[PDB]
């Protein structure tokens, strides 16, 4: 397990893993998606990639006669189903036989600028397409590789990250690791049950949050909350701080906000907390993200020091806690023990200081018993 600094990448357009396909070896760039649950690289040359997998150039490519399509909160690819060898490089250097899709269409897919050309999904295998049938690229790993039906990863940002298939690499990180229950085998989903902001809860039915699932997901670039969710949250942060003016079109995402002085405009906004359920009902404990980790920077340009994005994003059906709250974190997918676990992460800090925190346990006993709604 010295699989550490493993992943490339960032907040804005994924973190992607390196791993060689076919025979001989074809050198892709994948992006690690705890979201969804297809191994699929691009077949044909597109808009922005500068590579694709070839499958008449690998002597152990077979093919498994079928097509495949996904459909992802917004974008879509189609592929040819078909099983070859893999390599992980840093890793397992020992070749394993997996599925893989490749696309031959796909529509907002690949967007400008990113570095991959391929994703990984390490959901469950409900959530395969065609079907549960389809053996999960990890699923096969653990079988061939014999390791641990476990997987944890540290995102660094704010460098690239870890994904360490098989284990929990201690030197990722300090301090406890809290675990919380995996609710439904399909997205990695668990109980929300509070979200606090500047340490004001929002008081909302807690069932709210989980409608209809809170789902952990690095395939997910922002932290996506249900709509009235979302609301209280935007009118929570701006109330802490209603002297700056970043326009509700900043909270959309429609734009972005530019700083022409060299100080940071964080100082100015609340921390963001979210509950999770323990393992032990009766506790919980809680994860939280500095507006370092929300009021994400861009590229100066200009006259301007930097321009900033908000990281939250309003959703219909789901509370995705995507990259925005996972880079402060080193989240540990137990697939085995059926949890989720977090831990402070180091490489989450801006200029000597902790950019996230996480602390329990609180009492439970007093508010909700089961906040996902059945
Ligand atoms: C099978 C299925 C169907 C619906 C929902 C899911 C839940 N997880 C979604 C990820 O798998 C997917 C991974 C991905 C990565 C690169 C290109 C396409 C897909 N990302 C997203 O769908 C996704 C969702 C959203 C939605 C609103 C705001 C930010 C944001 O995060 C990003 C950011 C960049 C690219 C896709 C993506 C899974």
Redesign the pocket.
């Given at each position: 397990l010295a699989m550490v600094d493993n992943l490339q990448g960032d907040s804005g357009?994924?973190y992607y893993l390196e791993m060689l396909i076919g025979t001989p070896p074809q050198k892709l760039q994948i992006?690690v998606?705890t979201?969804?649950?297809?191994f699929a690289v691009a077949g044909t040359p597109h808009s922005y990639i500068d590579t694709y997998f070839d499958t008449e150039r690998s002597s152990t490519y077979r093919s498994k006669g079928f097509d495949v399509t996904?459909?992802?909160?917004?974008?879509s690819w189609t592929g040819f189903v078909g099983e070859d060898l893999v390599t992980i490089p840093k890793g397992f250097n020992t070749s394993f036989l997996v599925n893989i899709a490749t696309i031959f269409e796909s529509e907002?897919?690949?967007?400008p600028g990113?570095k991959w050309n391929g994703?990984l999904?390490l959901?469950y295998a409900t959530?395969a397409?065609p079907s549960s049938s389809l053996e999960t690229f990890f699923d096969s790993l653990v079988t061939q590789a014999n390791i641990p039906n476990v997987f944890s990863m540290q995102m660094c940002g704010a460098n690239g990250g870890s994904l360490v298939l098989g284990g929990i690499e201690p030197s990722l990180y300090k301090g406890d690791i809290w675990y919380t229950p995996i609710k439904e085998e399909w997205?990695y989903q668990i109980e929300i049950l509070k979200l606090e902001i500047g340490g004001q809860s929002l008081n909302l039915d807690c069932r709210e949050y989980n409608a209809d699932k809170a789902?952990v997901?690095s395939?997910?670039?922002?932290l996506?909350l249900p709509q009235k969710v979302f609301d209280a949250v935007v009118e929570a942060v701006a109330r802490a701080s209603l002297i700056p003016e970043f326009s509700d079109g900043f909270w959309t995402?429609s734009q972005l906000a530019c700083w022409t002085n060299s100080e940071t405009p964080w100082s100015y906004f609340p921390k963001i907390s979210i509950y999770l359920r323990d393992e032990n009902s009766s506790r919980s404990f809680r994860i939280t993200i500095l507006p370092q980790l929300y009021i994400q920077p861009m590229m100066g340009a200009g006259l301007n020091y930097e321009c900033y994005r908000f990281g939250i994003?309003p959703?219909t059906n789901?509370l995705?806690i995507?990259?925005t709250v996972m880079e402060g974190f080193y989240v540990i997918f137990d697939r085995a023990q059926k949890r989720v676990g977090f831990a402070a992460s180091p490489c989450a800090e801006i200029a000597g200081a902790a950019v996230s925190e996480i602390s329990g346990p609180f009492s439970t006993e007093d508010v909700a018993s089961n906040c996902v709604p059945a």
């Open positions: 357009r994924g992006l998606d979201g969804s649950s297809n996904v459909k992802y909160t917004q974008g907002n897919f690949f967007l990113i994703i999904g959901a959530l397409k997205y789902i997901d395939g997910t670039t922002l996506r995402g994003s959703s789901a995705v995507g990259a």
